[PDB]
Amino acid sequence: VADRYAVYWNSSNPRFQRGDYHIDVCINDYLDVFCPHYEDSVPEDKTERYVLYMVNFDGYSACDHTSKGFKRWECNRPHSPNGPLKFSEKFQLFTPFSLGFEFRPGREYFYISSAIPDNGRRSCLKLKVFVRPTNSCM
Numbered sequence: 679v680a681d682r683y684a685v686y687w688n689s690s691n692p693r694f695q696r697g698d699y700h701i702d703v704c705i706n707d708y709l710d711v712f713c714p715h716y717e718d719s720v721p722e723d724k725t726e727r728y729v730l731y732m733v734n735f736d737g738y739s740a741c742d743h744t745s746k747g748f749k750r751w752e753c754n755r756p757h758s759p760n761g762p763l764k765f766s767e768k769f770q771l772f773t774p775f776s777l778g779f780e781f782r783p784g785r786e787y788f789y790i791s792s793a794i795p796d797n798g799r800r801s802c803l804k805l806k807v808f809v810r811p812t813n814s815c816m
């Protein structure tokens with residue numbers, strides 16, 4: 679957890695349950711988000727699915743995924759064949775591709791999700807990521 683940070687994005691995770699999950703990372707580190715994953719023996723009704731978004735602080739604060747940001751990943755395979763669906767975020771300064779994001783050191787970024795079956799629409803799981811300043815990373 680000094681290059682790759684594992685984040686299990688589901689409501690049974692106490693860190694998300696508490697509603698203030700936050701992590702510090704260094705440029706070039708990776709954030710690996712693991713979508714909810716279940717055994718076939720699971721009741722659907724109890725299968726979590728989410729869309730994950732990156733928003734600004736106000737959107738993060740208000741669980742607003744409609745006003746501004748980007749849809750980043752879709753946790754839509756609760757029974758994915760080889761382990762949970764996993765999305766990776768690399769905190770890099772430059773990206774040569776258009777499907778990517780570039781980060782700046784000494785800045786915080788925000789992520790929130792909306793339930794896919796769209797339930798109780800109001801509260802949300804969320805995550806704050808602070809990219810430490812260059813140097814404050816040894």
Ligand SMILES: *[C@@H]1O[C@H](CO)[C@@H](O[C@@H]2O[C@H](CO)[C@@H](O[C@@H]3O[C@H](CO)[C@@H](O)[C@H](O)[C@H]3NC(C)=O)[C@H](O)[C@H]2NC(C)=O)[C@H](O)[C@H]1NC(C)=O
Nearest residue numbers: 684685686687688689690691692712713714715716726762
């Ligand atoms: C909801 O979030 C939970 C909170 O973490 C998930 O539980 C964690 O599952 C992890 C993966 O199965 C376990 O971590 C380790 O992951 C590495 C990476 O592949 C494995 O090698 C390890 O074997 C595995 N176990 C360890 C730590 O050695 C965690 O142990 C486990 N943590 C907790 C808090 O129980 C749930 O899976 C997730 N639930 C749903 C519905 O997806």
